[PDB]
From a paper:
The process of eukaryotic DNA replication begins during G1 phase with the loading of the minichromosome maintenance (MCM) heterohexamer comprising Mcm2–7 subunits into head-to-head double hexamers with double-stranded DNA passing through the length of a long central channel. This topological loading requires the Origin Recognition Complex (ORC), Cdc6 and Cdt1 proteins. In budding yeast, Cdt1 forms a stable complex with MCM before loading. We propose that Cdt1 stabilizes a conformation of the MCM ring in which the Mcm2–5 gate is held open to allow duplex DNA passage required for helicase loading. To understand Cdt1–MCM at an atomic level, we determined crystal structures of two non-overlapping fragments of S. cerevisiae Cdt1 spanning amino acid residues 1–438 and 495–604.
The structure of Cdt1(1–438) was refined using two independent crystal forms to resolutions of 2.7 and 2.1 Å. The fragment comprises a pair of well-defined domains corresponding to the N domain (residues 14–298) and the M domain (residues 299–430). The relative orientation between the domains is preserved in all four crystallographically independent copies of the protein chain observed in the crystal structures, indicating a rigid linkage between the domains. Perusal of the Dali structure comparison server revealed a striking similarity between the Cdt1 N domain and Fe(II)/α-ketoglutarate-dependent dioxygenase superfamily of enzymes, such as AlkB and other DNA/RNA dealkylators, and the Jumonji C histone demethylase21. However, the key His and Asp residues involved in chelation of the Fe(II) ion co-factor in the active sites of these enzymes are not conserved in the Cdt1 N domain. Moreover, an α-helical hairpin (α6/α7), which extends the dioxygenase fold, occludes the degenerate active site of the N domain. These observations indicate that the dioxygenase structural fold was repurposed for a non-catalytic function. By docking the crystal structure of NM Cdt1 into the Cdt1 density, an MCM interaction can be modelled, whereby the middle domain of Mcm2 is sandwiched between the A-domain and AAA+ domain of Mcm2 and extends to contact the A-domain of Mcm6, following the outer perimeter of the MCM N-terminal domain. Conversely, the N domain of Cdt1 projects away from the MCM ring and does not appear to be involved in any contact with the helicase motor. The N domain of the yeast protein plays an important role in MCM loading, but makes little or no contact with MCM in our structure.
Numbering used by the authors: 12 to 159, 186 to 210, 217 to 270, 277 to 331, 335 to 432
The structure:
């Protein structure tokens, strides 16, 4: 049972008629289908042609603007181009692929039209009403190529459009749902529209099959537009292509990995608080490997003795960790007070505050960014 809103261009075709329909959809959805588009056939022919014609230029290179041709695993090739209106920007890699150019111009007029509708639909500011126009925009044309498993990603633009509603999965709002509508184009909204909706609209990540020769066009206002759009694009491209990111943005990449490590230890701390309190209800402090399975269950991942010791790095007085007579690590809450607990009554706030400054210390430093919290060394 299709649960994706479908906009039929045969019925409603005009902007005054379309605008309320779009707005009604965007209040509950981030994804919708487009039925009976005029150039759907031309579009499907061009996509068909790509199987034998106009192959990805493998000698083109893939630069720091995340454009060009990029060989991926399992004989899949990525081709990508980014265009921006702003003369101050240097995205000069021109698309020489005649099929992709033809596909682009059809997806462009279409995408731009519905992009303006989306902004007028759920964004209040009048300054942002004209941000995207025929004279102000940024596009990302992406092509996957298969010689003959899913990639999750969260688009960051206003609107991203697929010329073929196939081999794509979405989350309806708990589990991914496949989309197979060969006569439809697929539309999905990005994080920019949601943020600018100030609550009205929310979006969600997509899954695509990289082996299914998927093409897509994403629309932005000019990348220099302040909400730092470029920062979100960069972070998204880095998440998508970590190997390229290692080459051109190794610091940005390492910082991103560190952020996950911070999220890890913070959640680990609160989970440790819960587990230790429940156990303390019964003299002798509990051994750590006894508590680990329960800790792992709440963390929904494998947690070893080394992970617990990461907390002591962030805050050495958080727990009393010692070796018992049986040479096992015992852990318990501190009995006595220090300067910290005499002036800050919250243990969680104490930790999270000291975790943020530790993180800030690492990224401020003039040293190679470590991507994890080192484990604290306990003496014997």
């Amino acid at each position: 049972v299709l649960r994706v809103p479908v906009i039929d261009l045969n019925r409603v075709s005009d902007e005054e008629q379309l605008l309320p329909v779009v707005r009604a959809i965007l209040l509950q959805h981030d994804t919708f289908l487009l039925k009976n588009y005029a150039n759907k056939a031309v579009l499907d022919a061009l996509l068909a042609g790509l199987t034998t014609k106009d192959l990805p230029d493998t000698s083109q290179g893939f630069d720091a603007n995340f454009t060009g041709t990029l060989p991926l695993e399992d004989d899949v090739w990525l081709e990508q181009y980014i265009f921006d209106t702003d003369p101050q920007l240097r995205f000069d890699r021109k698309c020489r692929n005649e099929s992709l150019c033809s596909i682009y111009s059809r997806l462009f007029k279409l995408g731009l039209f519905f992009a303006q509708l989306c902004v007028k639909s759920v964004v209040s500011s009048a300054e942002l009403q004209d941000c995207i126009s025929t004279s102000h925009y940024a596009t990302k044309l992406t092509r996957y190529f298969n010689d003959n498993d899913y990639v999750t990603f969260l688009p960051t633009g206003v609107l991203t459009i697929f010329p073929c509603a196939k081999a794509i999965r979405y989350k309806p709002s708990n589990s991914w749902v496949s989309i197979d509508e060969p006569d439809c184009l697929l539309f999905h909204t990005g994080t920019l529209l949601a943020r600018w909706s100030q609550g009205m609209h929310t979006t969600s990540p997509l899954q695509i099959d990289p082996r299914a020769n998927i093409v897509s066009l994403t629309i932005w206002p000019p990348l220099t537009t302040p909400i730092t759009i470029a920062n979100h694009l960069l972070e998204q491209q880095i998440k998508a292509f970590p190997k390229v990111a290692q080459q051109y943005y190794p610091r940005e990449l390492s910082i991103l990995r560190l952020q996950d490590a911070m999220k890890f230890v913070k959640e680990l701390f609160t989970v440790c608080e819960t587990v230790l309190s429940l156990n303390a209800l019964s003299g002798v402090p509990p051994e750590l490997h006894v508590l680990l399975p329960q800790i792992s269950s709440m963390m929904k991942r494998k947690i070893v003795q080394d992970d617990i010791l990461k907390l002591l790095t962030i805050w050495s007085d958080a727990y009393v960790v010692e070796l018992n007579s049986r040479g096992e690590l015992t852990m318990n809450l501190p009995k006595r007070d220090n300067l910290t607990t005499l002036t800050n009554k919250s243990r969680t706030l104490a930790f999270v505050e000291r975790a943020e400054s530790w993180y800030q210390q690492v990224i401020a430093s003039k040293d190679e960014i470590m991507t994890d919290v080192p484990a604290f060394k306990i003496n014997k």
